Symmetry: C2
Subunit: 377 residues, 2 copies
């Protein structure tokens, strides 16, 4: 059993607060994209595959303000971030690399690498909380030749961007100095964009300048309500690019140019409204959750980054997260118990619950009312 199987069951329920996938409806301007889907289809039929790859990649890294990625122009597209992760797994296995992986994190990252026989060892997120302790903690704790981070992190919303540039600079300094491969999953990085103090800087400038061996994964699926018709992106350092390219081409020839055409519309639309239609739904549900559960047995854990998931600690002398999950699901509200996010030792997660916020606000507000009723015993 894993979180994905919990999410399969939650997808049959009205109050599904489990999977982080986007289930809010379309904004007014996004309904305009839906209306042009026939034109987007016929356009992709007549044009060249590489044109739609280029236009998508350009729009994506323009919105994310990663100009270095567009100069190097070596990013590869796949169906989903887990597929990019499997390509990384093939590289890890070829090079006999074991991975020190962030904990907590969503469990399928562990599972898919473990299912490829990649040796995996945890490193706790708290190693990154104090910027001046990052490098010595990594020197003491990382004993593999690859380090896999998720930033911003799922489920906590933590980000090294709390430290400006310096948190990432210290991680990169460690990996370069010690000849480590740095893997980073940026799937939640869109939730930093347009933030006054947290907006992501050009990561690819730092990765390229440092000369570090790296694999960087980006995603669309958590940001936009595209019903999992999505694209992920992977970028490799120059010294491993050829090997990773050949691995990637064994998996797929191309992402659908129709999907790429459509996603480009969503990226451009969010450039125009500075991600308002994404951010506004999350803010309404996040605030509704905080206000409803303030003072309850579910203690909100404020995230560094306003990501699409909310993380709660269970404050009770006897009840665990397993009990809370059972009590809520009995009344029709499905959350994820924290145990699976502590993939190296699930018992560490029996004090946490994750709730998805990428939801229609009316349904979400009714889910919170029912949740509060259950927790009131």
């Amino acid at each position: 059993l894993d979180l994905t199987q919990h999410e399969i069951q939650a997808l049959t329920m009205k109050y599904n607060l489990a999977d982080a996938h986007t289930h809010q409806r379309q904004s007014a301007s996004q309904q305009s994209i839906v209306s042009r889907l026939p034109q987007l289809w016929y356009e992709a039929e007549e044009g060249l595959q590489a044109t739609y790859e280029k236009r998508f990649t350009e729009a994506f890294f323009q919105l994310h303000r990663q100009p270095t990625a567009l100069v190097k122009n070596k990013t590869m597209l796949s169906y989903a971030a887990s597929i990019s992760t499997m390509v990384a797994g093939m590289f890890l296995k070829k090079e006999r690399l074991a991975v020190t992986l962030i904990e907590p994190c969503f469990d399928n990252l562990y599972d898919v690498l473990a299912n490829m026989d990649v040796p995996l060892y945890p490193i706790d997120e708290s190693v990154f909380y104090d910027v001046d302790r990052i490098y010595p903690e990594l020197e003491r704790r990382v004993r593999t030749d690859a380090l896999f981070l998720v930033d911003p992190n799922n489920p906590t919303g933590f980000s090294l961007l709390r430290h400006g540039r310096k948190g990432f600079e210290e991680v990169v300094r460690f990996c370069k100095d010690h000849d480590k491969l740095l893997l980073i999953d940026f799937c939640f990085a869109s939730f930093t964009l347009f933030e006054p103090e947290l907006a992501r800087f050009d990561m690819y400038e730092l990765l390229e300048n440092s000369g570090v061996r790296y694999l960087a994964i980006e995603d669309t699926g958590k940001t936009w309500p595209v019903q999992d018709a999505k694209c992920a992106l992977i970028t490799a350092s120059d010294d491993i690019w050829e090997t990773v390219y050949n691995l990637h081409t064994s998996v797929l020839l191309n992402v659908s140019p129709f999907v790429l055409n459509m996603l480009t519309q969503y990226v451009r639309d969010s450039a125009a409204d500075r991600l308002a239609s994404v951010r506004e739904v999350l803010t309404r549900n996040r605030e509704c959750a905080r206000k409803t559960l303030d003072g309850s047995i579910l203690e909100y854990q404020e995230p560094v980054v306003k990501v699409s998931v909310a993380w709660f600690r269970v404050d009770h002398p006897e009840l665990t997260a397993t009990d809370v999950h059972r009590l809520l699901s009995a009344d029709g509200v499905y959350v994820l118990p924290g145990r699976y996010f502590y993939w190296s030792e699930p018992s560490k997660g029996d004090a946490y619950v994750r709730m998805a916020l990428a939801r229609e606000p009316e349904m979400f507000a009714d889910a919170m009312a029912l949740t509060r009723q259950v927790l009131d015993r």
Copy 2:
């Protein structure tokens, strides 16, 4: 380098006859699906994921006449046949099994499995030509714990269905008797449907009844012009189903319900016209290729099944498929050399060329005229 990289280049060219992916345009009735994409979007948005999975799986296995698969109801959906193959690869790696794999076959099957460190040993397609020799030839030549077939085969269009039920029954008898995991890629099986003598029987009835350990992969992307917005299916025998299920859920939670809803309309559309809009385009291009190249240095290899690719032998004392590819691409026509389809011994494939038929027939006819003009000055 491999065939997919050849196909990346061909996608930039006017006469791309390389990748088997579908590039013909929409039929009149398929245009009515495209016109309803907004409706199909809102349906999936408001409906349940399991609803669109169920309706797609039902439509697919009704068209393919595999009712046993719907009774068992244990099939898992993924983004593409290669993703299903990687799940099978993870199973093969967990069990530390070596694979005997059909040769020739499209090279990314070999590459995906090799990139997961699965040991791979070839078995030539000719072992399946004589139905009464299949079992003793497998006894001699399958000395691994798994056997991986592609049926109908890509690039040759060969199928055990030439033997009715008996070819598959002999393969399954061997694998059951000798404790072999049987993997079968059925991605080209749509091209057998509604054929008076070749239409596929219920494969899952045979696989289930025999009790063989198996993994079976099905596909939509080679059949319909859906611009690679597609879905593959994998089904496992009962004894390994739980392990394979857990591997599969580590890869993805769900295929887009919008894509599933759209694909369901294409499946239903082709049930309505008995796949005529697919078959007629392929037949037009197949016949154009055959007539155009008759008597040339490219010798047409008639396939058992009318699949979406055509296979030719290079009939020349010196020129190779690599030479032919070089000469044709210099004039703008991009075909695939046979080399990488002979994944264990690529030089064997320098005797062959593959051409994709899932193309607009006007472009294709222009491509053949240019192809023969290039060939006849050599």
